[PDB]
Design a protein around this ligand. Structure first.
Ligand code: ADP
Ligand code: ADP
Ligand code: ADP
Ligand code: MG
Ligand code: MG
Ligand code: MG
Lengths: 191, 527, 550, 541
């Protein structure tokens, strides 16, 4: 049953063209128009793409209004970062935000100093990662010992975005699914 | 040849699809409507009782009219949904008689029971009621007298007809004070363009209902109020009202402008340009002297401190329906450009005062004789006393809404049903056929509205109705039942009137409700 | 019609089921009445059709009678049990109108509940029915008709056709009407110093599926369903004046009483004791064999000692049977049922006066069955009914149908006065009671008016079962009847109308005298009274209280 | 002798597959099973027919006494029924008339052919019999025509056309609904001395706007349309300008932005000061040109911005969204303008004329009415339905859709000639086919006779719904055809129907020629397929 679904489900618009000579045109082009429409929706939703270094008055808008988005429940995820330059984990998490911002343009990446965020915040609890969605806090994450701590990598951060429902599991942009071209080249030769 | 051991037969309909033939289903559909009818039976009349409904979400909702009672109870049966559709249609078109139209619709179904038990199919009895309504609507038009022949005053007409609407509610003793509110409220509206959204009533808690007050102005309820509030004067003599759809916010909902600069000296210019633009918009509003600034979209924080300095009142986050009511009162339309403003678009009022009631603070315009709108602040003991009195005056407004379009007086207290019934009895005796017994049943069904008036009052019904049958033998009009004197008499001498559209649309809707489920013999439900 | 079940109340705590009051009880009681009234509404009249009920073991019962169809319908509701027991009271007493009395009671509870909703008390409603029924029975006495100027048994024939109808054997009513009337005249007797009475279930019914219902043979005499004791016995006794001996004595290797324990010291006594214990029964059978009993009848059984003695003489033996059938054989043949043979003197004997008399006896074969057919009885005549059909379920339908037909003709001969049928009684009582209470006026005019309309349900029910225009017949019935009641005494034609009405076969107004539709006057008497008490029992109920079982 | 060997072809096709072949008894299983749904369409036939309530799985309740609307929602597992389902849908989409005849005939041909199969006649011969009988039926219907119409313009001539169609669905309302449909067709058709060459007509011309509340007699005809929409900005003048030019723009009124996403770039603060006024002057250059020619109404399909709405409020220009694309072009047909996705400027040739636009409440809800008097219209009309329940108004819409579909069935072909209705031509076909069967000796004569018997249900179904005896009026009607006058004999439906004779011209009941030909063909083709199949193969779920 899955062998028929893998022709369309496991191929993007660039990979669907492989089956142009083999499979029927009406079977293939019917799905390419569907996948083409999904690509256009992501382009319209790409309202972001760099870290929004904000300040508090604005928090009451950027962090929360955005989380409502269109309010068609067009919700928008907003990853906040209570930065603290003295901590080593904070500078690591700041690099992950800019790296993920260039890839996931639909998700908003927010950064602010922790001293300016909350009155007399504990410095030991920093860096803090909050995830808003439709005005509600989906995840109040603590320091990155859960995500490896000092040895945190980009692969661990992208895996966390899938757990909170920010990115799909089978997304082609994730490093877990985005296999290298040399990897797929060896598979075709050994097939 | 066969594929396997055995082959079970196919059911034609889907598994679980209910279906039935014969006269049992149409009797079940009629009994289903009578089951819904019995809930609204004792509600009919001034001495009737309210109905308490509590849905699955555990929200209390008390009501007297059958419009929202049937909306709360989610009806599964299609035949019982016929009473719900006409009740909402009667509520949408006229706004009165939602309980009586369901009682008349079920009574025609109730009187059609023994005729369906006979061999007469439903296509004969449909023709009899459908023939009777053609004479009933004409007889109501013939019994409709015009008010201009007497050359009476127009103000007393609305008070006379609205008094009937305030029966069977919590208002009937306090009707001396509140009937003046709705009559004066609807008269402020334009006769050519009478609108239903300009009569919005706010469900404000606290206070007794008699402590309310009618003002030609409109209130809005204080909004978010960033720091700045409670510094301006909350009382003005002749303020100028301004409305702005433009969002006075420092790039809050605006699209993200990607600003890129390459000099340090220009960085001081670009950060001050934000302050330069927002202050230019405030100075342009300041020059016109707008004492009350309003907006549907939120007002920035810096504007509140600026308007607080020059004693300018400000408020934001107003809804579209409430803001549309303001524009009908304060004259000029909305402008979303600070440079294109003009003095002539500003409104005015003779007095303005903010006062708190129910721990709620409301801004009240006062002294607006040129206003083509109105407002009502019903005060009440509990959250259902407010909502019940809210929809009650909405029904009272709906009577005077339709009375101004066409001025027709008709009898009340169940009298109009009986003069129509006895005329059909005079028409039925000359037929001498199957339609005679059907029209006599239609005359018997119209008699039910006098019954519930007497049953809820406690007096016996068979004795008093026979007295009316002896009284209606001669020529008589406006002859019904009353409860104050406990003795029947002339309703015109008792001064109770109603519109003619209530009785006309009730007979057409009740007969159409009857013919819908008498023109069927089966109800199929899948799944 | 009742929805939104009553809430469990904390202020009123009663053990068992919850209490419920108000108008929902009388609505539920009427709803329970419609559950049983709609069942029997379709099987009314000749055009009416019946239904089947399975017994959950493959067996079923196709039933026309109201008592039988309600007996198998075990109604759990209390109000329905009143009508179930009423039909069991109706069929045992009169055997007619079992379907109509339930239909009358259902229509009364319908309109009585409507009158309670019209805000008149049930006590005034019950008083309106009683004064109306007292005038109704007075009106039934006025419309009586004495049988006169009738040729032979025609009045008993055509009145049986009314009861024979509404069954499967109504088409064969021309054949069964003769034998049914001839059967009851054969079992005539005398009791209470000249009062004529007939016994209950005197005629037998034998289930012999076979040839057809048309060829049902009327054997002028008694019939008994019993197997032969020994197959070597003769199945046909020739010669007239056959003597029949009815007994209840038991004749088997008999045992001594309970409190006897034999104890002997001598071994040789076992020879005499074993022979005398068996030989004591031989003294009973040696005396009746010498008396010449050609065919002996007995209730308790007979065993191989005696059975063989009876055969060494060409005597017919009879095995176990019911206790009641032997009583009527003794009455017809002239014998006397002996519980224990003895004599007033100090010695046992057997007299010749205990023997019966009949002309012929023979064991006829009804295609699988041994049945001893007795015919030509001397003392009192007798009769039996040989039912035949396609299958055993039809024979069961023929049993209760003949039981209703026999019961109707039984009460017909008790009172010579008769009343017409076909809704003419209900149509006349409707218009008669509508005219009544016009002088009374104030309150009871509405109660008696709805009572008069309640009796019209029978001519409405017969019409819709025919699948014809019902109101066309109701317009002819009531109007014709009214034009008759109002009329001058001196108007022959109009008066006649009082006599006729609805016809279900051809669909027109014809005379009942020429058509032959007729009922007894006793069938309507005490039928409305039972329906009245049935209405009173449910109508006076206000609240319902249920206690759960322990 | 306890467990069977389990049919050793069980190694073949899986347990979910069920075979119901013949010889086993497939025909007997099918013709019968479908008698239940045959009685559904039979009871819902005629003017006194009973509507049927169908509740789908979603819960949207419908009540319609047709056949195409019912069977669309019924989830039917039996495959042989489904041949009759979409065969009825072909009548709905093509002609829009004759759903019920198709059901009472396609099913009756299978019911009446029980005698042929039970006697032992070959199934292949039965298909050849009905096909040759179908050809004789199509040729014979042309001779029984007496309603050759050539005007097809005036309103009184449509009384023989629309009123028989409306008299079937909800017989009580004839004059009122026929006035709405006939007056709608007169507004649709253009005023001309002689309009020929097959003028164009479509079902989308006459639309139905359902309004809650109000008696059916209080309805009226509107040349424009009525939308449940809230106007914005101002109140109309309603007599001052005397005519209004209406521009319809596909794109919204805003600054022209590209498909690819952009943003604002500002290198210095001098552009920041002018950016607030630049957007105002940009739209002002494009909005001032629209007001010069006097366009008093603008219709933008997409969402209109507040900056564009603000400039239009002061000049008093009406705005309207109209989000759906199908109903956007119908408004253009009223005014007689073209869509313009370009902003450009209004030209006189592409802009239409509208008399007036007024706003009120018909059933409590505020609506926008585009009624115009003395204006030129082309293929546009609406019928404002007033009713007590939404469930009843749904049937009035489909009754009007079937009424205007008959107008498409007339004007699209060269001739849509009438025939005698009310059980007049059906009994005539029984006499024609009865005489035709004796002309051709052969074994197929039994099929020709039984094909005629299937047409008997049309008269008696009107008598069964009328509460009359079938064995009295039906054989009495045959005596009336003995012998113009004999052709106009039909079935009466009244209390005085004991005679069973009523003239057709007193009330003018008629049927279409093309509707019955297409119904007889699809009915015969439906029965041809069911009688031709022998094996039916199911599957799991
Ligand atoms: N003052 C009055 N005198 C006599 N009858 C009245 C009076 N006021 C109302 N009624 C009667 O009471 C009935 C029910 O009115 P009500 O229930 O208050 O209105 P609605 O049914 O529209 O909510 C009406 O049919 C009317 O005839
Ligand atoms: N041949 C007939 N003609 C007219 N009426 C009949 C005929 N046979 C029976 N009836 C009517 O049918 C009613 C019921 O009859 P039946 O079914 O035999 O009795 P029950 O009601 O005890 O079952 C009677 O009241 C009688 O008037
Ligand atoms: N007043 C009337 N008198 C006689 N016949 C009528 C009357 N009204 C309707 N009919 C008949 O009822 C029939 C209903 O047919 P219908 O099934 O609606 O047609 P179609 O199958 O083409 O939709 C028509 O053929 C018509 O002749
Ligand atoms: Mg009211
Ligand atoms: Mg009987
Ligand atoms: Mg049609």
């Amino acid at each position: 049953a899955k062998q028929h679904e893998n022709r369309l489900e496991d191929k993007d618009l660039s990979d669907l063209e492989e089956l142009e000579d083999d499979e029927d045109e009406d079977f293939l082009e019917a799905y390419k128009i569907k996948r083409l429409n999904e690509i256009r929706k992501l382009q319209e939703r790409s309202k972001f793409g760099e870290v929004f270094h904000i300040n508090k008055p604005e928090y009451n808008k950027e962090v929360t209004l955005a989380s409502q988005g269109k309010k068609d429940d067009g919700g928008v995820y907003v990853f906040v970062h209570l930065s603290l330059q003295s901590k080593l984990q904070s500078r690591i998490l700041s690099h992950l935000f800019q790296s993920a911002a260039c890839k996931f343009r639909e998700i908003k990446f927010v950064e602010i100093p922790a001293n300016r965020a909350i009155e007399n915040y504990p410095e030991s609890n920093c860096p803090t990662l909050i995830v808003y969605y439709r005005g509600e806090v989906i995840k109040n994450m603590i320091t990155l010992l859960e995500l490896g701590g000092n040895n945190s990598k980009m692969e661990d951060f992208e895996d966390f975005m899938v757990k909170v429902g920010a990115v799909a599991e089978g997304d082609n942009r994730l490093i877990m699914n985005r296999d290298d071209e040399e990897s797929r080249e060896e598979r075709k030769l050994h097939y | 040849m066969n594929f396997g051991s055995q082959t079970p037969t196919i059911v034609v309909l889907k598994e679980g699809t209910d279906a039935s033939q014969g006269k049992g289903q149409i009797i079940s559909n009629i009994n289903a409507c009578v089951a819904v009818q019995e809930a609204l039976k004792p509600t009919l009349g001034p001495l009737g009782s309210d109905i308490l409904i509590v849905t699955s979400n555990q929200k209390t909702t008390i009501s007297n009219d059958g419009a929202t009672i049937l909306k709360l109870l989610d009806v599964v049966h299609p035949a019982a949904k016929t009473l719900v559709d006409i009740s909402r249609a009667q509520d949408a078109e006229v706004g009165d008689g939602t309980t009586s139209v369901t009682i008349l619709a079920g009574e025609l179904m109730k009187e059609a029971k023994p005729f369906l038990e006979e061999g007469i199919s439903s296509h004969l009895i449909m023709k009899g009621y459908r023939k009777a309504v053609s004479l009933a609507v004409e007889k109501i038009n013939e019994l409709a007298v015009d008010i201009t022949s007497e050359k009476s005053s127009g103000r007393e007409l609305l008070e006379r007809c609205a008094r009937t609407a305030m029966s069977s509610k919590l208002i009937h003793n306090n009707a001396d004070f509140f009937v003046k509110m709705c009559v004066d409220a609807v008269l402020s509206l334009d006769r050519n363009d009478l609108d239903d959204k300009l009569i919005g009533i706010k469900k404000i808690p606290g206070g007794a209902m008699e402590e309310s007050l009618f003002i030609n102005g409109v209130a809005f309820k204080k909004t978010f109020s960033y720091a700045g509030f409670e510094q301006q004067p909350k009382k003005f003599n002749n303020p100028k009202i301004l409305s702005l759809n433009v969002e006075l916010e420092l790039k809050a909902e605006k699209d993200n402008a990607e600003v890129r600069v390459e000099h340090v000296e220009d960085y001081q210019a670009i950060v001050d340009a934000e302050w330069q633009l927002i202050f230019e918009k405030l100075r342009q509003v300041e020059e016109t002297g707008a004492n009350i600034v309003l907006s549907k979209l939120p007002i920035g924080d810096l504007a509140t401190q600026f308007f607080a300095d020059r004693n300018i009142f400000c408020a934001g986050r107003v809804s579209a329906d409430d803001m549309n009511r303001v524009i009908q009162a304060v004259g000029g339309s909305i402008q979303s450009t600070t440079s294109d403003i003009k003095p002539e678009h500003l409104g005015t009022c003779a007095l303005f005062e903010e006062m708190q009631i129910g721990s709620e603070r409301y801004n009240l315009f006062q002294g607006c004789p040129q206003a083509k709108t109105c407002t009502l602040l019903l005060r009440g003991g509990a959250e259902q006393v407010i909502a019940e009195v809210e929809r009650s005056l909405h029904d009272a407004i709906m009577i005077v809404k339709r009375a101004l379009q066409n001025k027709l007086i008709v009898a009340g207290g169940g009298a109009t049903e009986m003069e129509v019934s006895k005329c059909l009895r005079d028409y039925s005796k000359t037929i001498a056929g199957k339609q005679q017994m059907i029209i006599n049943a239609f005359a018997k069904a119209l008699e039910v509205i006098p019954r519930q008036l007497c049953e809820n009052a406690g007096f016996d019904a068979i004795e008093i109705l026979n007295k009316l049958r002896l009284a209606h033998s001669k020529g008589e009009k406006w002859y019904g039942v009353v409860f104050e004197t406990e003795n029947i008499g002339d309703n015109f001498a008792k001064f109770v009137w109603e519109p003619a559209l209530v009785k006309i649309n009730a007979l057409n809707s009740a007969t159409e409700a009857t013919n819908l489920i008498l023109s069927v013999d089966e109800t199929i439900t899948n799944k | 019609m009742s929805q939104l079940f009553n809430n469990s109340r904390s202020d009123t705590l009663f053990l068992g089921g919850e209490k419920i009051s108000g108008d929902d009880i009388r609505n539920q009681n009427v709803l329970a009445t419609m559950a049983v009234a709609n069942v029997v509404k379709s099987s009314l009249g000749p055009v009416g059709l019946d239904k089947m009920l399975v017994d959950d073991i493959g067996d079923f019962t196709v039933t026309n009678d109201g008592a039988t169809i309600l007996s198998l319908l075990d109604v759990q509701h209390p109000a329905g049990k009143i009508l179930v027991e009423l039909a069991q009271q109706q069929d045992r007493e009169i055997g007619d109108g079992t379907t109509s009395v339930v239909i009358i009671a259902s229509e009364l509870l319908k309109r009585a509940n409507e009158l309670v909703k019209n805000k008149i008390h049930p006590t005034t409603i019950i008083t309106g029915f009683r004064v109306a029924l007292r005038e109704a029975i007075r009106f039934i006495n006025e419309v009586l008709s004495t049988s006169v100027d009738t040729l032979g048994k025609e009045t008993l024939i055509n009145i049986a056709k009314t009861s024979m109808s509404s069954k499967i054997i109504g088409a064969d009513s021309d054949f069964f009407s003769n034998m049914v009337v001839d059967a009851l005249l054969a079992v005539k007797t005398q009791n209470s110093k000249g009062e004529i009475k007939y016994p209950v279930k005197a005629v037998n019914v034998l289930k012999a599926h076979g040839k057809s219902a048309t060829e049902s043979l009327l054997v002028p005499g008694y019939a008994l369903n019993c197997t032969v004791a020994s197959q070597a016995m003769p199945k046909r006794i020739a010669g007239g004046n056959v003597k029949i001996a009815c007994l209840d004595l038991n004749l088997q290797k008999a045992r001594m009483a309970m409190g006897v324990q034999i104890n002997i010291d001598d071994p040789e006594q076992l020879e005499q004791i074993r022979k005398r214990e068996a030989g004591i029964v031989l003294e009973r059978v040696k005396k009746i064999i010498d008396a010449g009993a050609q065919v002996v009848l007995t209730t308790k059984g007979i065993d191989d000692l005696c059975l063989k003695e009876f055969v060494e003489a060409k005597i017919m033996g009879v095995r176990r049977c019911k206790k009641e059938d032997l009583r009527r054989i003794a009455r017809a043949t002239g014998a006397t049922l002996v519980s224990s043979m003895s004599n007033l003197e100090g010695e046992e004997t057997f007299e010749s006066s205990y023997l019966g008399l009949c002309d012929e006896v023979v064991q006829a074969k009804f295609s699988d069955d041994e049945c001893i057919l007795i015919k030509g009885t001397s003392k009192h005549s007798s009769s039996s009914i040989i039912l035949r059909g396609a299958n055993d379920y039809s024979l069961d339908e023929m049993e209760r149908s003949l039981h209703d037909s026999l019961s109707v003709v039984k009460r017909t001969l008790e009172s010579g006065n008769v009343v017409p049928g076909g809704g003419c009684v209900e149509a006349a009582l409707n218009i008669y009671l509508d005219n009544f209470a016009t002088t009374v006026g104030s309150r009871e005019q509405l109660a008696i008016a709805e009572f008069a309309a309640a009796l019209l349900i029978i001519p409405k029910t017969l019409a819709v079962n025919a699948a014809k225009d019902s109101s066309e017949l109701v317009a002819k019935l009531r109007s014709y009847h009214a034009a008759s009641q109002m009329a001058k005494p001196e108007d022959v034609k109009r008066r006649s109308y009082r006599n006729y009405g609805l016809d279900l076969i051809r669909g027109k107004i014809v005379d009942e005298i020429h058509a032959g539709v007729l009922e007894p006057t006793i069938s309507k008497v005490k039928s409305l009274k039972s329906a009245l008490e049935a209405c009173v029992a449910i109508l006076r109920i206000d609240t319902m209280i249920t206690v759960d079982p322990e | 002798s306890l467990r069977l060997p389990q049919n050793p072809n069980a190694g073949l096709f899986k347990q979910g597959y069920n075979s119901y072949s013949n010889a086993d008894g497939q025909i007997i299983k099918s013709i019968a099973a479908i008698r239940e749904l045959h009685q559904m369409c039979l009871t819902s036939m005629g003017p006194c027919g009973r509507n049927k309530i169908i509740v789908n799985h979603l819960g949207k309740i419908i009540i319609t006494n047709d056949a195409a609307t019912m069977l669309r929602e019924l989830d039917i597992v039996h495959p042989a029924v489904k041949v009759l389902v979409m065969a009825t849908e072909q009548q709905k989409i093509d002609m829009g008339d004759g759903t019920n005849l198709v059901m009472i005939l396609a099913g009756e041909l299978l019911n009446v052919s029980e005698k042929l199969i039970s006697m032992g006649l070959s199934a292949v011969e039965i298909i050849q019999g009905y096909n040759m009988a179908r050809k004789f039926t199509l040729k014979e219907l042309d001779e029984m025509v007496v309603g050759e119409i050539t005007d097809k313009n005036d309103k009184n001539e449509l009384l023989k056309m629309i009123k028989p169609v409306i008299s079937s669905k909800k017989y009580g309302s004839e004059d009122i609904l026929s006035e709405l449909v006939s007056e709608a067709v007169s507004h649709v058709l253009p005023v001309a001395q002689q309009a020929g060459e097959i003028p164009y007509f479509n079902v989308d011309s006459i639309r139905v706007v359902k309004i809650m509340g109000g008696s059916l007699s209080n309805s009226t005809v509107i040349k424009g349309m009525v939308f449940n929409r809230e106007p914005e900005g101002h109140v109309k003048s309603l007599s001052e300008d005397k005519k209004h030019k209406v521009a319809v723009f596909t794109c919204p009124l805003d600054i022209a932005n590209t498909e690819t996403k952009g943003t604002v770039l500002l290198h210095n603060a001098q552009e920041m000061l002018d950016f607030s006024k630049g957007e105002e002057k940009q739209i002002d250059a494009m909005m001032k040109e629209i007001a010069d020619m006097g366009v008093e109404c603008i219709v933008a399909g997409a969402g209109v911005g507040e900056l564009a709405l603000h400039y239009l409020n002061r000049y008093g220009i009406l705005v309207l969204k109209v989000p759906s694309k199908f109903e956007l072009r119908r408004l253009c047909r009223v005014c007689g303008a073209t869509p313009l996705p370009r902003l450009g400027a209004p030209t006189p040739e592409e802009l239409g004329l509208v008399e007036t636009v007024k706003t009120m409440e018909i059933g409590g809800d505020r609506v926008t009415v585009f009624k115009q008097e003395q204006g030129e219209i082309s293929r546009t009309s609406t019928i404002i339905l007033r009713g007590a329940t939404q469930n009843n108004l749904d049937d009035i819409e489909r009754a009007i859709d079937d009424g205007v579909a008959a107008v498409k069935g007339l004007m699209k072909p060269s001739g849509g000639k009438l025939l005698p209705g009310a059980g007049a031509t059906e009994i005539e076909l029984i006499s024609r086919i009865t005489k035709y069967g004796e002309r051709t000796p052969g074994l197929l004569q039994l099929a020709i006779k039984q094909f005629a018997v299937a047409f008997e249900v049309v008269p008696r179904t009107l008598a069964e719904t009328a509460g009359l005896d079938v064995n009295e009026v039906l054989p009495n009607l045959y005596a009336a055809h003995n012998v113009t006058d004999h052709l106009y004999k039909g079935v009466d439906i009244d209390g005085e129907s004991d005679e069973g004779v009523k003239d057709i011209r007193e009330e003018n009941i008629y049927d279409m020629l093309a509707t019955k030909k297409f119904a007889i063909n699809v009915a015969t083709e439906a029965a041809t397929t069911v009688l031709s199949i022998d094996q039916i193969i199911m599957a799991k779920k």
